[PDB]
Design a protein around this nucleic acid. Structure first.
Ligand SMILES: [Mg+2]
Ligand SMILES: [Zn+2]
Lengths: 70, 422, 141, 176, 38, 131
RNA sequence: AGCCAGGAUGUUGGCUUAGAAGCAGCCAUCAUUUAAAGAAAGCGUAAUAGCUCACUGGUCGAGUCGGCCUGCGCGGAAGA
């Protein structure tokens, strides 16, 4: 989750699992579970829900300006 | 299946095999409520594994009475007792071993039963289909004695009178042992585990006998809870016997290679007969019930009659989605199940030819009805379609089904992230 | 006997000692139950204070037995809502440790001298005296 | 240094024979003989065995300490002998023994039979572990390293031939 | 290993050795710190 | 980091209190936790006094330089590891025996409390309360 | 150097009332206890664990430890 440009906010451990909260950007999550299952031996799942907005320097959005609908 | 050398009349055992991938887990979700029991297969060397615990949770949600098979005793490094203990400590179950292993790998020839107290070594050499009992084998007699004694203690704690009778120094008969073990296996007490090797065809012949001995019947499993459209709870317990009006449960639409519908339907109560009328009580829709088909011995038998507990499939036009009830106009409308998994992986998709967006629209429309664990989307940043599925493979075996079923090719892509600026 | 395998030195606000999903990912791998988790550590802590983490032991038995003698929150640890300043150590040279008086600091070092004992009570007194100045600012009286 | 400047005190019942440079030590286990580097002076001297650097040989003290340690090991071999213990971790890894041949079943398609050198007797108290016994330290260490090299331990699941005391430093496969 | 023209101890656990006229580093703890020449 | 000056100073400082003081005890504790050598030391400081440092001084000439001032036969503590504690309250008091009492209870070993020939005592307990 | 234990009671130092938990969020801390606790520099790092900073304690008893200047060498050093 830290590899992804995501920030963790608390990780309470309930029994038989650990509950880990982190407001990760959506761009850094487009195949998460398959990788997460590799990381968890297929014993974990993730639930994500949009919260807010912030910035990270990426002219990749300048890369996608004139490719479609200039 | 009549019985392995001990037989008791034709039983139509009805079998739904289950897949093993979390990717396509809805076929295990729908096919666990529809089930009365479940044979929890296991790898005698792999043991219990991510999917085994996953399907364990699946069954626990429906409290299905489950017995377990332990396959793969020929592979080197396989040991029945270790996997048995794994169940005891990886799933929090009470794994009563109603069998035992005679050897491992090459050694495997038979299994020590704790009630017959014999170990039948099948005649695999001519054909597995032939079988033979053997009196009290010395190799496992000390191990079997201690493990069999353990089984009697479970039979005892099974009934209160029995417990005290077990404290009477007296043993248990060929009916109180099983009837004690069975009568609560119906109620989610303990999972019976038998070992075998479907490759070498041993253990299995006995496994079928255990299913009759302990796995529940539609008359043994408790009666089904029911409800109407408005009455918060019309009890609607449909007594299983087909004396109530016809009341089934449809669990899977099918892309039949020829028919195009083949929605399987599991009849709990009542009797539909080669042409009747029932409504989509979950959808508020009406249509007839034409051509029931039940496939047995791999021959696709066509049936004009389907009854209580009788698993079959239907050819029709009007859609019945998975977990949708097929009750009579009497209508115990809603059955409690209204659950489908939310998609865990969402990927964009678009055809290779720019004019098959309509065809890819209609194909994904159909492939979205065929399983509920597969959403299709239209996000508003752009018209781009998003095929949100459960797993990578779940929606990777659908990008090529369009290639196979609907002869349309698509090119997937990462979804476009909504980027607003300020 | 069993202190070695389960191990988390952590105490959240002890209005309820050790709430189950409140602490963090070290006690999740700890079989200790919640039935007696905050019964005698939310009420019997009144020997020092209520609202401060009750310093306790993490000793249970493999036979499911649980015995321990809980210590108290420090007089410096209590210096977040009881001794005034919510700020404290790390910046006692760039900030104040609070309007702390030694007319109270010595009394607190003497009356809270039960858990950390010694040959002479002045030893635990100097212990707490270094504990407060472990921030860098202590009552100069 | 203070290695060679320390006598190898022979036990009771061992027969040492310092013939020139090459030297034999007889014992209860067997017989070990060693050709000392010519830069070493060794005497019996009343139940001991002492080494001293010959004159004209700048590397006299290195060879002195070396020869002293080697003869100490030879003595301990002829009286006690050294016993190496190996284990087979990994599923289906079994190492049954037939006389002077260790039949290792270590996962290769081909069968593995390492014919022991003269002097090392391998036994297996279990399907999956070897216990080498021998008279010479160097050759038993060599046989252990020979067996271990067939299926060396690996950094992920410890599978392979390992010494009983070996501390295999493992690691995780990947994040992925 | 690395064949840098300059071997140095990268860890507390590394050792300088001169096997066969080549100056190697043999770190028992981290096998990345294992160096050959120079 | 015990320098020679500091060495001769500390040996003399820990030997003077025992030389002009009373009969004390020592232990042989090479395997104990901070807690075991700590609570026993607190007990020992409560019994007699807080002057005793629990550090050990069993070097081959630590006691062979301090104990040999008078009653030099009391220089028999060289071979085994030792961290002593004084007992001003009476010869062969509880402190001169509490170490050996705890030798098998919550403590490793107590060097048998060899004693010292201050009055040239023999095998017996020096103080008996006739009371 | 080798060989026999330990590296607190504030001790999760309060230390940005999520902890960066003896060793990343920042800092100044033996204060009985001392040979110990540094209150941080890898294994977890979020703890533990057993090694870790070090240090004594015992064991046996001869030099050892670093840097500086230096002579000759060593690797750096691959072409048809
Ligand atoms: Mg040069
Ligand atoms: Zn290194």
């Amino acid at each position: 989750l830290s590899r992804r440009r995501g920030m963790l906010k608390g990780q309470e451990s309930e029994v038989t699992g650990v509950k880990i909260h982190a407001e990760v950007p959506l761009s850094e999550m487009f195949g998460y579970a398959t990788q997460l299952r590799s990381l968890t031996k297929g014993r974990a799942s993730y639930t994500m829900e949009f919260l807010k907005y912030d910035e990270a320097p990426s002219n990749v959005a300048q890369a996608v300006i004139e490719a479609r609908g200039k | 299946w009549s019985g392995m050398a001990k037989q008791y009349e034709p039983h139509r055992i009805n079998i739904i095999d289950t897949p093993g991938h979390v990717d396509f887990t809805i076929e295990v979700e729908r096919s666990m409520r529809v089930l009365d029991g479940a044979v929890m297969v296991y790898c005698a060397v792999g043991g219990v594994q991510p999917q085994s615990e996953t399907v364990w949770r699946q069954a626990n949600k429906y409290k299905v009475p489950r017995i377990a098979f332990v396959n793969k005793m020929d592979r080197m490094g396989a040991n029945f007792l270790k996997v048995v203990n794994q169940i005891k400590t990886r799933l929090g179950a009470n794994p009563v071993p109603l069998q035992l292993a005679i050897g491992a790998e090459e050694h495997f020839t038979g299994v020590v039963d704790l009630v017959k107290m014999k170990a039948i070594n099948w005649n695999d050499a001519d054909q597995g289909v032939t079988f033979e009992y053997e009196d009290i084998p010395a190799d496992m007699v000390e191990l079997a004695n201690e493990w069999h004694q353990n089984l009697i203690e479970s039979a005892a704690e099974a009934s209160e009178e029995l417990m005290e009778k077990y404290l009477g120094g007296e043993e248990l008969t060929e009916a109180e042992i099983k009837g004690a073990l069975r009568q609560r296996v119906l109620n989610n007490e303990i999972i019976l585990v038998t070992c075998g090797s479907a490759f070498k065809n041993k253990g299995v012949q006995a496994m079928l006998d255990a299913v009759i001995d302990y796995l529940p019947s539609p008359v043994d499993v408790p009666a089904i809870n029911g409800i109407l459209d408005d009455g918060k709870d019309t009890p609607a317990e449909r007594h299983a016997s087909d004396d109530e009006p016809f009341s089934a449960l449809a669990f899977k639409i099918a892309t039949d290679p020829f028919v195009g519908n083949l929605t399987f339907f599991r009849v709990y109560s009542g009797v539909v007969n080669s042409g009747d009328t029932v409504l989509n009580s979950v959808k508020a829709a009406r249509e007839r019930f034409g051509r029931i088909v039940q496939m047995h011995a791999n021959k696709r038998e066509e049936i004009k009659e389907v009854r209580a507990g009788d698993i079959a499939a239907a050819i029709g036009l009007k859609d019945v989605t998975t977990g949708d009830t097929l009750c009579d106009p009497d209508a115990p409308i809603i059955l409690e199940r209204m659950e489908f998994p939310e998609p865990v992986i969402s990927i964009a998709v678009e055809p290779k030819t720019k004019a098959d967006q309509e065809k890819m629209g209609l194909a994904l429309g159909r492939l979205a009805k065929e399983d509920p664990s597969f959403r299709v989307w239209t996000d508003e940043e752009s018209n781009q379609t998003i095929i949100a599925g459960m797993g990578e493979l779940h929606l990777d075996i659908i990008v090529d089904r369009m290639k196979r079923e609907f002869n349309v090719e698509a090119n997937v892509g990462k979804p476009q992230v909504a980027y607003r600026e300020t | 006997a069993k202190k070695v395998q389960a191990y988390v030195k952590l105490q959240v606000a002890a209005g309820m000692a050790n709430p189950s999903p409140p602490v963090g990912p070290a006690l999740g791998q700890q079989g200790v139950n919640i039935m007696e988790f905050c019964k005698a550590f939310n009420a019997k802590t009144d020997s020092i204070e209520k609202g401060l983490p009750i310093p306790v032991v993490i000793t249970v038995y493999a036979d499911r037995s649980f015995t321990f003698v809980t210590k108290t929150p420090p007089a410096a640890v209590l210096l977040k809502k009881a001794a005034g300043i919510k700020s404290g150590s790390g910046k006692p040279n760039k900030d104040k440790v609070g309007k702390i008086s030694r007319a109270q600091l010595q009394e607190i070092a003497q009356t809270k001298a039960a858990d950390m004992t010694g040959a002479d009570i002045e030893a635990m007194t100097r212990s707490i005296e270094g504990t407060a100045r472990s921030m860098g600012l202590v009552v100069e009286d | 240094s203070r290695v060679a400047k320390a006598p190898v005190v022979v036990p009771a019942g061992v027969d040492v024979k310092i013939n020139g440079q090459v030297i034999t030590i007889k014992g209860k286990n067997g017989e070990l003989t060693r050709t000392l580097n010519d830069a070493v002076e060794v005497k019996h001297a009343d139940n001991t065995l002492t080494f001293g650097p010959r004159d004209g040989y700048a590397d006299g003290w290195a060879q002195a300490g070396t020869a002293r340690a080697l003869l100490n090991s030879m003595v301990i071999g002829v009286t006690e002998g050294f016993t190496k213990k190996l284990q087979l971790v990994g599923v289906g890894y079994r190492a049954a023994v037939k006389g002077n041949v260790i039949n290792l079943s270590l996962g290769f398609s081909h069968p593995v039979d390492h014919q022991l050198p003269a002097g090392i007797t391998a036994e297996c108290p279990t399907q999956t572990e070897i216990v080498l016994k021998g008279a010479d330290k160097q050759v038993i260490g060599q046989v252990a390293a020979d067996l271990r090299a067939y299926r060396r331990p690996e950094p992920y699941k410890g599978k392979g031939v390992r010494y009983a005391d070996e501390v295999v430093r493992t690691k995780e496969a990947k994040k992925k | 290993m690395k064949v840098r023209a300059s071997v140095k101890k990268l860890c507390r656990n590394c050792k300088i050795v001169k096997r066969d006229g080549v100056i190697r580093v043999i770190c028992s703890a981290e096998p990345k710190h294992k160096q050959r020449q120079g | 980091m015990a320098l020679n000056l500091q060495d001769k100073q500390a040996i003399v400082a820990e030997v003077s209190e025992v030389a002009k003081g009373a009969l004390s005890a020592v232990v042989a504790d090479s395997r104990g936790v901070t807690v075991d050598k700590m609570t026993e030391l607190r007990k020992a400081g409560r019994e007699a006094g807080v002057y005793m440092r629990v550090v050990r001084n069993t070097l081959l000439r630590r006691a062979v330089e301090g104990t040999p001032f008078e009653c030099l036969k009391d220089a028999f503590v060289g071979p085994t590891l030792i961290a002593y504690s004084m007992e001003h309250p009476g010869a062969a008091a509880r402190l001169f025996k509490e170490f050996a009492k705890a030798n098998a209870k919550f403590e490793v070993k107590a060097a048998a409390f060899e004693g010292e020939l201050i009055p040239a005592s023999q095998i017996d307990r020096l103080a008996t309360l006739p009371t």
